[PDB]
Design a protein around this ligand. Structure first.
Ligand SMILES: [Mg+2]
Ligand SMILES: [Mg+2]
Length: 335
Protein backbone atom coordinates (compact mmCIF):
# COMPACT_ATOMS: atom_id res chain seq x y z
CA UNK A 1 0.00 0.00 0.00
CA UNK A 2 1.80 3.20 -1.27
CA UNK A 3 1.40 6.36 0.84
CA UNK A 4 -0.73 8.99 -0.87
CA UNK A 5 0.81 11.98 -2.77
CA UNK A 6 0.63 15.55 -1.46
CA UNK A 7 -0.63 18.14 -3.94
CA UNK A 8 0.67 21.66 -3.32
CA UNK A 9 -1.88 24.23 -4.45
CA UNK A 10 -0.37 27.52 -3.28
CA UNK A 11 2.78 28.57 -1.33
CA UNK A 12 2.84 29.46 2.36
CA UNK A 13 2.66 33.07 3.88
CA UNK A 14 1.40 38.59 6.00
CA UNK A 15 1.01 36.83 9.43
CA UNK A 16 -1.15 33.69 9.23
CA UNK A 17 -1.51 30.25 10.78
CA UNK A 18 -1.19 26.92 8.94
CA UNK A 19 -3.11 23.82 10.05
CA UNK A 20 -4.35 20.53 8.64
CA UNK A 21 -7.91 19.15 8.69
CA UNK A 22 -8.90 15.45 8.23
CA UNK A 23 -12.44 14.35 7.26
CA UNK A 24 -12.94 10.58 7.32
CA UNK A 25 -15.95 8.22 7.40
CA UNK A 26 -14.56 5.07 9.15
CA UNK A 27 -17.51 2.77 8.27
CA UNK A 28 -19.19 1.65 11.52
CA UNK A 29 -19.24 -1.98 12.50
CA UNK A 30 -23.08 -2.08 12.33
CA UNK A 31 -23.13 -1.52 8.61
CA UNK A 32 -19.96 -3.38 7.61
CA UNK A 33 -21.88 -6.50 6.42
CA UNK A 34 -21.37 -9.19 3.81
CA UNK A 35 -24.73 -8.07 2.43
CA UNK A 36 -23.37 -4.59 1.72
CA UNK A 37 -19.73 -5.55 1.07
CA UNK A 38 -19.90 -9.08 -0.31
CA UNK A 39 -16.58 -8.64 -2.10
CA UNK A 40 -14.62 -8.23 1.10
CA UNK A 41 -13.90 -11.31 3.25
CA UNK A 42 -15.51 -11.48 6.68
CA UNK A 43 -12.16 -11.56 8.47
CA UNK A 44 -11.35 -8.25 6.73
CA UNK A 45 -14.75 -6.69 7.58
CA UNK A 46 -14.49 -7.65 11.22
CA UNK A 47 -14.08 -4.66 13.52
CA UNK A 48 -11.17 -6.20 15.53
CA UNK A 49 -9.32 -6.29 12.27
CA UNK A 50 -10.55 -3.05 10.57
CA UNK A 51 -10.15 -0.76 13.55
CA UNK A 52 -6.36 -1.24 13.27
CA UNK A 53 -6.27 0.10 9.73
CA UNK A 54 -8.65 2.95 10.64
CA UNK A 55 -6.48 4.03 13.62
CA UNK A 56 -3.43 3.74 11.37
CA UNK A 57 -4.97 6.00 8.79
CA UNK A 58 -5.84 8.57 11.39
CA UNK A 59 -2.38 8.39 13.06
CA UNK A 60 -0.55 8.72 9.70
CA UNK A 61 -2.58 11.75 8.60
CA UNK A 62 -1.66 13.40 11.86
CA UNK A 63 -4.17 16.22 11.29
CA UNK A 64 -4.41 19.15 13.72
CA UNK A 65 -8.25 18.85 13.36
CA UNK A 66 -9.99 15.49 12.74
CA UNK A 67 -13.68 15.05 11.75
CA UNK A 68 -14.93 11.50 11.84
CA UNK A 69 -18.37 10.02 10.80
CA UNK A 70 -19.75 6.59 11.72
CA UNK A 71 -18.08 6.61 15.03
CA UNK A 72 -19.87 4.07 17.20
CA UNK A 73 -20.59 5.34 20.66
CA UNK A 74 -18.71 2.69 22.65
CA UNK A 75 -15.73 2.91 20.16
CA UNK A 76 -15.48 6.68 20.70
CA UNK A 77 -14.97 6.12 24.37
CA UNK A 78 -12.83 2.97 24.45
CA UNK A 79 -10.78 3.39 21.23
CA UNK A 80 -10.85 6.70 19.35
CA UNK A 81 -10.66 9.12 22.32
CA UNK A 82 -8.14 7.24 24.55
CA UNK A 83 -5.78 6.63 21.61
CA UNK A 84 -6.05 10.15 20.31
CA UNK A 85 -5.52 11.58 23.80
CA UNK A 86 -2.11 9.78 23.73
CA UNK A 87 -1.36 11.77 20.65
CA UNK A 88 -2.30 15.06 22.39
CA UNK A 89 -5.85 15.56 21.00
CA UNK A 90 -8.98 16.30 22.82
CA UNK A 91 -12.38 15.38 21.35
CA UNK A 92 -16.13 16.00 21.23
CA UNK A 93 -18.63 13.26 20.15
CA UNK A 94 -22.35 13.08 19.82
CA UNK A 95 -24.38 9.99 18.73
CA UNK A 96 -27.51 9.96 16.64
CA UNK A 97 -30.80 8.83 18.23
CA UNK A 98 -30.26 10.05 21.75
CA UNK A 99 -34.04 10.61 22.22
CA UNK A 100 -34.92 7.15 20.79
CA UNK A 101 -35.67 4.40 23.24
CA UNK A 102 -33.41 1.33 23.02
CA UNK A 103 -31.46 -1.26 25.12
CA UNK A 104 -28.15 -0.42 26.85
CA UNK A 105 -26.50 -2.77 24.38
CA UNK A 106 -28.01 -1.01 21.37
CA UNK A 107 -27.05 2.39 22.78
CA UNK A 108 -23.32 1.37 22.58
CA UNK A 109 -23.58 0.71 18.88
CA UNK A 110 -25.30 3.85 17.69
CA UNK A 111 -22.90 5.91 15.58
CA UNK A 112 -22.37 9.61 15.35
CA UNK A 113 -19.93 12.40 14.56
CA UNK A 114 -16.70 13.30 16.38
CA UNK A 115 -14.35 16.26 16.16
CA UNK A 116 -10.81 15.96 17.51
CA UNK A 117 -8.31 18.83 17.87
CA UNK A 118 -4.62 19.06 18.99
CA UNK A 119 -4.66 20.72 22.42
CA UNK A 120 -1.26 22.43 21.78
CA UNK A 121 -2.75 24.37 18.92
CA UNK A 122 -6.43 24.80 20.00
CA UNK A 123 -8.66 25.34 22.96
CA UNK A 124 -12.38 24.43 22.88
CA UNK A 125 -14.66 27.31 23.73
CA UNK A 126 -18.07 25.68 23.05
CA UNK A 127 -19.46 22.42 21.67
CA UNK A 128 -22.87 21.90 20.08
CA UNK A 129 -24.98 19.13 18.63
CA UNK A 130 -27.47 19.88 15.84
CA UNK A 131 -30.39 17.34 15.70
CA UNK A 132 -31.78 17.64 12.24
CA UNK A 133 -35.09 15.91 13.19
CA UNK A 134 -35.76 18.46 15.89
CA UNK A 135 -34.94 21.40 13.67
CA UNK A 136 -37.17 19.96 10.93
CA UNK A 137 -40.07 19.43 13.42
CA UNK A 138 -39.61 22.97 14.79
CA UNK A 139 -39.78 24.48 11.29
CA UNK A 140 -42.34 22.30 9.53
CA UNK A 141 -44.96 25.18 9.63
CA UNK A 142 -47.59 23.26 7.71
CA UNK A 143 -45.44 21.40 5.25
CA UNK A 144 -46.41 17.72 5.24
CA UNK A 145 -43.13 16.86 3.43
CA UNK A 146 -41.01 18.50 6.16
CA UNK A 147 -42.80 16.31 8.55
CA UNK A 148 -43.11 13.05 6.61
CA UNK A 149 -39.75 13.00 4.86
CA UNK A 150 -37.40 15.29 6.83
CA UNK A 151 -38.36 14.98 10.48
CA UNK A 152 -38.37 11.18 10.34
CA UNK A 153 -34.64 11.21 9.58
CA UNK A 154 -32.42 10.80 12.57
CA UNK A 155 -29.14 12.49 11.22
CA UNK A 156 -26.95 14.94 13.23
CA UNK A 157 -24.03 17.41 12.91
CA UNK A 158 -21.70 18.54 15.72
CA UNK A 159 -19.81 21.82 15.86
CA UNK A 160 -17.07 23.09 18.16
CA UNK A 161 -15.86 26.67 18.73
CA UNK A 162 -12.09 26.71 19.08
CA UNK A 163 -9.62 29.34 20.16
CA UNK A 164 -6.60 29.18 17.78
CA UNK A 165 -3.40 29.72 19.83
CA UNK A 166 -1.62 33.03 19.08
CA UNK A 167 1.75 31.44 18.88
CA UNK A 168 0.63 29.82 15.58
CA UNK A 169 0.47 33.08 13.59
CA UNK A 170 -8.97 36.11 21.03
CA UNK A 171 -8.84 34.33 17.62
CA UNK A 172 -11.71 31.89 17.11
CA UNK A 173 -12.51 29.11 14.65
CA UNK A 174 -15.64 27.03 14.24
CA UNK A 175 -15.29 23.43 13.00
CA UNK A 176 -18.50 21.70 11.96
CA UNK A 177 -18.85 17.99 11.15
CA UNK A 178 -22.09 16.42 9.82
CA UNK A 179 -23.34 13.17 8.20
CA UNK A 180 -26.50 13.51 6.02
CA UNK A 181 -29.18 10.99 5.16
CA UNK A 182 -27.86 8.34 2.66
CA UNK A 183 -30.78 7.46 0.44
CA UNK A 184 -30.30 8.44 -3.28
CA UNK A 185 -33.99 8.98 -3.58
CA UNK A 186 -33.79 11.68 -0.87
CA UNK A 187 -31.99 14.69 -2.42
CA UNK A 188 -34.57 16.99 -0.81
CA UNK A 189 -33.77 15.70 2.63
CA UNK A 190 -29.97 15.97 2.01
CA UNK A 191 -30.38 19.56 0.87
CA UNK A 192 -32.69 20.53 3.74
CA UNK A 193 -30.41 18.91 6.31
CA UNK A 194 -27.43 20.94 4.86
CA UNK A 195 -29.48 24.14 4.97
CA UNK A 196 -30.52 23.42 8.58
CA UNK A 197 -26.95 22.64 9.62
CA UNK A 198 -25.55 25.83 8.05
CA UNK A 199 -28.30 28.14 9.53
CA UNK A 200 -27.88 26.45 12.89
CA UNK A 201 -24.09 26.97 12.68
CA UNK A 202 -24.74 30.64 11.87
CA UNK A 203 -26.75 30.94 15.13
CA UNK A 204 -23.84 29.39 16.99
CA UNK A 205 -21.56 32.02 15.37
CA UNK A 206 -23.43 34.89 17.10
CA UNK A 207 -22.59 33.95 20.71
CA UNK A 208 -17.20 36.98 12.32
CA UNK A 209 -15.45 33.65 12.98
CA UNK A 210 -14.07 31.53 10.06
CA UNK A 211 -15.70 28.11 9.44
CA UNK A 212 -14.30 24.75 8.48
CA UNK A 213 -17.17 22.46 7.44
CA UNK A 214 -16.45 18.76 7.13
CA UNK A 215 -19.17 16.32 6.04
CA UNK A 216 -20.19 13.13 4.49
CA UNK A 217 -22.98 14.72 2.52
CA UNK A 218 -24.02 11.67 0.47
CA UNK A 219 -24.17 14.16 -2.38
CA UNK A 220 -22.16 14.44 -5.64
CA UNK A 221 -20.50 17.67 -6.77
CA UNK A 222 -23.32 18.43 -9.24
CA UNK A 223 -26.07 18.32 -6.56
CA UNK A 224 -28.24 21.05 -5.00
CA UNK A 225 -26.38 20.38 -1.71
CA UNK A 226 -23.01 21.26 -3.22
CA UNK A 227 -24.35 24.17 -5.25
CA UNK A 228 -25.87 25.61 -2.06
CA UNK A 229 -22.66 25.41 0.00
CA UNK A 230 -20.47 26.58 -2.95
CA UNK A 231 -22.52 29.49 -4.31
CA UNK A 232 -23.75 30.87 -0.98
CA UNK A 233 -27.35 29.88 -1.83
CA UNK A 234 -29.91 28.02 -3.99
CA UNK A 235 -33.18 28.61 -5.86
CA UNK A 236 -36.14 27.60 -3.72
CA UNK A 237 -37.45 25.60 -6.66
CA UNK A 238 -34.25 23.61 -7.26
CA UNK A 239 -35.14 20.22 -8.74
CA UNK A 240 -33.56 18.55 -5.65
CA UNK A 241 -36.52 19.77 -3.60
CA UNK A 242 -39.14 17.69 -5.54
CA UNK A 243 -42.34 28.21 2.15
CA UNK A 244 -40.87 26.76 5.38
CA UNK A 245 -37.45 26.78 3.57
CA UNK A 246 -36.94 30.48 4.29
CA UNK A 247 -36.65 29.51 7.97
CA UNK A 248 -33.06 28.56 7.01
CA UNK A 249 -32.21 31.65 4.92
CA UNK A 250 -29.59 34.03 6.41
CA UNK A 251 -37.36 36.23 -2.90
CA UNK A 252 -36.68 32.96 -4.75
CA UNK A 253 -33.40 32.06 -3.05
CA UNK A 254 -32.25 30.51 0.19
CA UNK A 255 -29.15 32.31 1.29
CA UNK A 256 -26.17 31.82 3.57
CA UNK A 257 -23.52 34.34 4.51
CA UNK A 258 -20.61 31.98 4.61
CA UNK A 259 -18.46 32.17 1.51
CA UNK A 260 -17.30 28.60 1.22
CA UNK A 261 -14.98 26.75 -1.07
CA UNK A 262 -14.32 23.01 -1.30
CA UNK A 263 -10.68 22.15 -0.48
CA UNK A 264 -10.83 19.55 -3.26
CA UNK A 265 -12.75 21.51 -5.86
CA UNK A 266 -12.13 20.82 -9.58
CA UNK A 267 -11.89 17.08 -9.32
CA UNK A 268 -8.74 16.53 -7.23
CA UNK A 269 -10.11 13.10 -6.07
CA UNK A 270 -12.06 11.08 -8.58
CA UNK A 271 -14.10 9.61 -5.71
CA UNK A 272 -14.31 9.65 -1.97
CA UNK A 273 -16.60 6.61 -1.52
CA UNK A 274 -15.38 3.61 -3.44
CA UNK A 275 -17.50 0.46 -3.71
CA UNK A 276 -18.38 -2.02 -6.43
CA UNK A 277 -21.77 -0.40 -7.09
CA UNK A 278 -20.91 3.23 -6.35
CA UNK A 279 -17.81 5.40 -6.75
CA UNK A 280 -18.16 9.17 -6.35
CA UNK A 281 -17.12 12.22 -4.40
CA UNK A 282 -19.66 12.54 -1.52
CA UNK A 283 -17.37 13.77 1.32
CA UNK A 284 -16.14 17.38 1.55
CA UNK A 285 -14.01 19.86 3.47
CA UNK A 286 -15.36 23.39 2.96
CA UNK A 287 -13.77 26.54 4.37
CA UNK A 288 -14.47 30.31 4.58
CA UNK A 289 -12.60 31.59 1.55
CA UNK A 290 -12.59 35.09 3.18
CA UNK A 291 -10.37 33.97 6.05
CA UNK A 292 -8.36 31.06 4.70
CA UNK A 293 -6.46 29.74 1.68
CA UNK A 294 -5.83 26.13 0.68
CA UNK A 295 -2.13 25.32 0.57
CA UNK A 296 -2.58 21.69 -0.40
CA UNK A 297 -4.51 18.42 -0.19
CA UNK A 298 -3.69 14.71 0.14
CA UNK A 299 -4.35 13.45 -3.41
CA UNK A 300 -5.96 10.10 -4.35
CA UNK A 301 -4.63 6.56 -3.69
CA UNK A 302 -2.51 5.70 -6.68
CA UNK A 303 -5.09 4.32 -9.09
CA UNK A 304 -2.60 2.01 -10.80
CA UNK A 305 -2.07 0.25 -7.48
CA UNK A 306 -5.82 -0.50 -7.33
CA UNK A 307 -5.87 -1.90 -10.84
CA UNK A 308 -2.64 -3.83 -10.10
CA UNK A 309 -4.43 -5.32 -7.11
CA UNK A 310 -7.76 -5.81 -8.85
CA UNK A 311 -9.52 -3.68 -6.19
CA UNK A 312 -12.98 -2.74 -7.47
CA UNK A 313 -14.55 -1.84 -4.14
CA UNK A 314 -13.73 -1.09 -0.51
CA UNK A 315 -13.27 -2.03 2.15
CA UNK A 316 -10.52 -4.58 1.35
CA UNK A 317 -7.90 -6.40 3.49
CA UNK A 318 -5.62 -3.34 2.95
CA UNK A 319 -8.25 -0.49 2.94
CA UNK A 320 -10.36 -0.50 6.13
CA UNK A 321 -13.22 1.80 5.09
CA UNK A 322 -15.31 2.29 2.00
CA UNK A 323 -14.45 5.94 2.18
CA UNK A 324 -11.02 7.53 1.63
CA UNK A 325 -9.86 10.19 4.07
CA UNK A 326 -9.68 13.88 2.99
CA UNK A 327 -6.66 15.85 4.37
CA UNK A 328 -6.07 19.54 3.71
CA UNK A 329 -3.61 22.14 4.89
CA UNK A 330 -5.26 25.51 5.36
CA UNK A 331 -3.83 28.99 5.92
CA UNK A 332 -5.79 31.31 8.23
CA UNK A 333 -5.36 35.10 8.27
CA UNK A 334 -6.66 37.01 11.43
CA UNK A 335 -8.71 40.24 10.93
MG1 LIG B 1 -21.47 4.52 5.30
MG1 LIG C 1 -21.80 7.78 3.10
Amino acid sequence: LPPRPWITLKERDLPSASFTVMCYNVLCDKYATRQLYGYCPSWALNWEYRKKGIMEEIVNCDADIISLQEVETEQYFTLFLPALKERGYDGFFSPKSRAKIMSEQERKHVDGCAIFFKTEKFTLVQKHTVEFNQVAMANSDGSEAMLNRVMTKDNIGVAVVLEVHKELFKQLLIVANAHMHWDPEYSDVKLIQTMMFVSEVKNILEKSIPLVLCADLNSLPDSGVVEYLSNGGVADNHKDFKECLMNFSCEGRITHGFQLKSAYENNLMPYTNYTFDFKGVIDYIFYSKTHMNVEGVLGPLDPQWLVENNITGCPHPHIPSDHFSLLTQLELHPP
